[PDB]
Design a protein around this nucleic acid. Structure first.
Ligand SMILES: [K+]
Ligand SMILES: [K+]
Ligand SMILES: [K+]
Length: 14
RNA sequence: GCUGCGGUGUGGAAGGAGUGGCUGGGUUGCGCAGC
């Protein structure tokens, strides 16, 4: 699961 | 691979989910949780 580590709104990019 | 919660702050105590984010911590860092 090496993708979006965290979610919600604009959380977790780069 | 995807998604939820201003829940976290060398401001987080007078705010949000980026209609401030090429103005910073931050190519949205950090923590927790779900598929
Ligand atoms: K801020
Ligand atoms: K912030
Ligand atoms: K933040």
């Amino acid at each position: 699961g090496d993708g979006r580590r965290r979610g919600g709104g604009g959380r977790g990019q780069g």
